[PDB]
């Protein structure tokens, strides 16, 4: 049981976007299929659904006219055209499974998919930039001194920030985003370690941003 | 409600031709020795017909040279047991044909396993002096061969038991089908009397063959698998392929469609293949009702119609309906109730078998009569 | 369209509390209810149906009453995992299918005995200076109480509408937070300047605890 | 494309199309046949129980192929 989404992205108020969902592991041919979006950090909101024959859809009033849905049986597809797009659009989108099999009235979602994030912001995308926060030179010898990366200047959200790709975890603080006076996002992750270690082990963050395509390993050095 | 214009036939003349044939002087020493080599062959008949013959069963060679070898040698006392329950195998199956043949009068429908078993059917059906498709259908639908087939006892001599299983040869496959469904159509009137109502009578089965149209009228004489439709050419009128223009037009002149009229103000349902059609006259309680969320309509008086989607049950009364639960597509053709052509008090009352232009014509003899005055 | 009501926004409760939220409607949806529980960065997962029929795997701590407009959704022993977004949904005749408002449920926070903020600073970068901006960065980590004072401070002058605040969640293993506050300039305001400062107030600390450094 | 059905509320009336056909033209007679033995009907000593139940068993045979023969 299975649904994968894409279509995804940032797309400018006005300009269309097709969001499609593909299904694996049951018979997609006998059940409805729901489109229920949410907004960045509220609640759950209704926004289509499609019969299992494909000859009943119905749109929540908020998107009546401008979105529209479709499906395809042999390739176990559900397609949502949205044109047209106002800035409160921006949300994340779930395809979803009807409970009840074979009928014309719609019940309730059982299986979710993963989601596809959509922002309609006039702003561009762009990959972010990473700078070294270095460590002092002035740490005692014991000495629990501090280093880091500061992720600047990337849209949209989210970036994803580990230590030598995982192999360092404990005392590793990753902050959340600010969105700064330019319009774009940036963040920190910090890390606390023996000064001792300093100038023996290697310090590299590894900073991953899938909406520009963007991969940087930063080496952090005294 | 036209099965009494079909002709009648012997459905099991010519597994009893077979018989007949069989019992003369040297056929069954002829089959013997035939099947003396192998466990089927091919028999030229004395009446020139070549037919499949089949050796389901050897008991003379297990009694010979199995059971009562051992049982009359020496000390009749047999040392093993489990040949008493070897032999009860091998033998069930001659007992329960020999009761199947007693209960139904040596002449049995449907064709059991212990006539005749699925490897043997296969291969019977494989070996049959028809086209591969024949083959393939015959063999995926085994059941449904099964149900269209005979097996008559025909002779025991000779230390021979045989019997014809006369199976069906299925010549026209893959044309067209389509079922006729039909209802009353009455008019909707609140008088309790001057009420007429129209029915059409050609309802059943019509499939294409060779250019006509085969109807059946008794559809119950015909099996359904997944989109196929199992009938008899026996219990089928051959009409010409215009009789289907009855449900693009029903006052179409190349042909005459047959109805019946009446003034019985019956409410009924008639679950069709994705849907039902609801006649829903006087004060009846008629209601399309969803499993899982009950009542989703109730009914107008008239003649209406529900698709199989997102609709469960059917009540009419006190009669409940369970709708086929089949996948499809269902149209809804618009149209004015053909009853609302005709006048209440010039409308034949009562005519069992008729058709459109008879109804018309005895309709222009009643207005010739009264337009005399 | 019927308008559905969950009551309350949001709780705070221990482990192993009986938790009772609620949900009303405009009008009468008899039964067509369904109760889902979204965890923290999850999916929504149908925890009922028909307002009390439970799904199947579901843990039979939950429990779903009501009828007619009102129900009511109860965990007996509040756990873990239970955290989250709740939200009550109706199904009624032909789908405009409207959520609640949904209902979060936390953890009570940790006791924590106070620990005093570790301070670091970290000057803006070489690569990012070419670039023409820079970016003081001021750190506080595994400190509790949850409240701070972060003040910028550039040649004894205090800032003022040009730093920003980030601040971690409570950690699950010494219950304590870190915060960053970033101040930003341009090249020719950072150069425009000598010395940069953090001062840190806060209740483990005796004095203000100031972290200062010179360009260069 | 698959089953259709269209209503026609004019004559009151549904017809269901999408069927296919197989339609019995004709018959094929095969003979089936069963070998049977004519077994001596007697002499052995019904003193075993094992004995006894073959006896038994081969009274059954031979009244089946009676009860065949009477089928005449």
């Known amino acids: 049981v299975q649904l994968v989404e894409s279509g995804g992205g940032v797309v400018q108020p006005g300009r269309s976007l097709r969001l499609s969902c593909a299904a694996s592991?049951?018979?997609?041919?006998?059940?409805?299929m729901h489109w229920v979006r949410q907004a960045p950090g509220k609640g759950l909101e209704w926004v289509a659904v499609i019969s299992y024959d494909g000859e009943n859809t119905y749109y929540a009033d908020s998107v009546k006219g401008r979105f529209s849905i479709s499906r395809d049986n042999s390739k176990n597809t559900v397609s949502l055209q949205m044109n047209s797009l106002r800035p409160e659009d921006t949300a994340l989108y779930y395809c979803?499974?009807?409970?009840?099999?074979?009928?014309?009235?719609?019940?309730?979602?059982?299986?979710w998919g993963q989601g596809a994030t959509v922002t309609v912001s006039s702003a561009s995308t762009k990959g972010p930039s990473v700078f070294p926060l270095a460590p002092s030179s002035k740490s005692t010898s014991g000495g629990t001194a501090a280093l880091g990366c500061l992720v600047k200047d990337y849209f949209p959200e989210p970036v994803t920030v580990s230590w030598n790709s995982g192999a360092l975890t404990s005392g590793v603080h990753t902050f959340p985003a600010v969105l700064q006076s330019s319009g774009l996002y940036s963040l920190s992750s910090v890390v606390t370690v023996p000064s001792s270690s300093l100038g023996t082990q290697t310090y590299i963050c590894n900073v991953n941003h899938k909406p520009s395509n963007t991969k940087v390993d930063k080496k952090v050095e005294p | 409600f036209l099965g009494f214009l079909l002709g009648v036939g012997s459905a099991i003349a010519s597994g009893v031709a077979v018989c007949k044939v069989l019992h003369l002087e040297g056929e069954v020493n002829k089959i013997k020795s035939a099947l003396l080599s192998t466990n089927k062959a091919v028999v030229s008949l004395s009446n020139g017909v070549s037919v499949l013959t089949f050796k389901v069963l050897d008991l003379k060679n297990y009694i010979d040279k199995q059971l009562l070898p051992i049982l009359n040698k020496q000390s009749c006392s047999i040392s093993n047991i489990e040949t008493v329950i070897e032999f009860q195998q091998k033998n069930n199956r001659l007992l329960e044909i020999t009761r199947e043949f007693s209960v139904n009068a040596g002449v049995t429908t449907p064709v059991s396993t212990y006539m005749l078993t699925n490897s043997e059917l296969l291969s019977l059906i494989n070996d049959m002096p028809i086209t591969n498709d024949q083959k393939k259908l015959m063999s995926n639908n085994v059941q449904i061969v099964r149900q269209q087939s005979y097996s008559i006892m025909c002779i025991i001599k000779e230390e021979v038991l045989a019997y014809v299983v006369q199976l069906p040869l299925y010549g026209v496959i893959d044309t067209p089908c389509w079922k006729l469904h039909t209802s009353p159509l009455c008019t909707t009137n609140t008088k309790e009397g001057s009420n007429i109502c129209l029915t059409r009578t050609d309802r059943g089965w019509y499939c294409d063959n060779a250019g006509s149209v085969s109807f059946f009228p008794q559809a119950e004489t015909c099996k359904v698998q997944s989109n196929r439709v199992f009938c008899d050419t026996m219990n089928s009128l051959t009409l010409p392929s215009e009789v289907n223009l009855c449900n693009v037009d029903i006052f179409n002149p190349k042909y005459d469609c047959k109805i019946m009229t009446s003034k019985t103000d019956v409410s009924s349902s008639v679950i069709t293949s994705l849907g039902a059609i609801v006649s829903c006259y006087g004060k009846t309680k008629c209601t399309a009702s969803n499993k899982n969320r009950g009542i989703i309509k109730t009914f107008s008086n008239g003649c209406d119609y529900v698709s199989n989607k997102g609709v469960d049950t059917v009540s009419v009364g006190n009669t409940l309906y369970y709708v086929n639960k089949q996948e499809g597509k269902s149209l809804y053709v618009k149209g004015e109730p053909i009853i609302n052509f005709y006048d209440p008090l010039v409308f034949p009352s009562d005519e069992f078998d008729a058709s459109i232009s008879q109804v018309n014509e005895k309709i222009n003899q009643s207005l010739a009569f009264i337009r005399k005055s | 369209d019927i308008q559905m009501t969950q009551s309350p926004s949001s709780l705070s409760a221990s482990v192993g509390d009986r938790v009772t939220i609620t949900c009303q409607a405009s009008?009468?949806?008899?039964?067509?209810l369904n109760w889902y529980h979204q965890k923290p960065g999850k999916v929504p997962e149908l925890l009922m149906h028909?307002?009390?029929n439970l799904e199947t795997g579901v843990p039979s701590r939950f429990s779903g009453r009501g009828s007619g407009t009102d129900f009511t959704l109860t965990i007996s022993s509040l756990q873990p995992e239970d955290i989250g977004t709740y939200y009550c949904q109706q199904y009624d005749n032909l789908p405009p299918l409207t959520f609640g408002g949904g209902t979060k449920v936390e953890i009570k926070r940790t006791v924590r005995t106070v620990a005093a903020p570790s301070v670091f600073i970290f000057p803006p970068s070489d690569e990012q200076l070419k670039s023409g901006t820079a970016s003081v960065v001021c750190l506080l980590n595994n400190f509790y109480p949850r409240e701070a004072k972060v003040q910028w401070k550039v040649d004894n002058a205090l800032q003022s509408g040009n730093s920003q605040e980030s601040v971690t969640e409570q950690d699950s293993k010494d219950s304590t937070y870190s915060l960053s506050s970033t101040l930003t300039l341009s090249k020719a305001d950072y150069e425009k300047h000598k010395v940069y400062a953090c001062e840190v107030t806060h209740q483990g600390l005796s004095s203000p605890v100031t972290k200062s450094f010179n360009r260069g | 494309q698959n089953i259709t059905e269209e209503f026609y509320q004019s004559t009151c009336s549904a017809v269901s199309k999408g069927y296919l056909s197989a339609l019995r033209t004709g018959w094929y007679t095969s003979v089936i046949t069963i070998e049977l033995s004519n077994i001596k009907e007697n002499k052995c000593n019904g003193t075993d129980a094992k004995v006894k139940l073959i006896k038994q068993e081969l009274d059954k045979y031979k009244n089946a192929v009676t009860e065949l023969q009477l089928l005449m």
């Open positions: 009008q009468d949806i008899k039964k067509y």
């Open positions: 592991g049951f018979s997609f041919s006998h059940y409805a």
């Open positions: 979803a499974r009807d409970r009840i099999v074979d009928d014309y009235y719609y019940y309730g979602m059982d299986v």
């Open positions: 028909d307002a009390s």
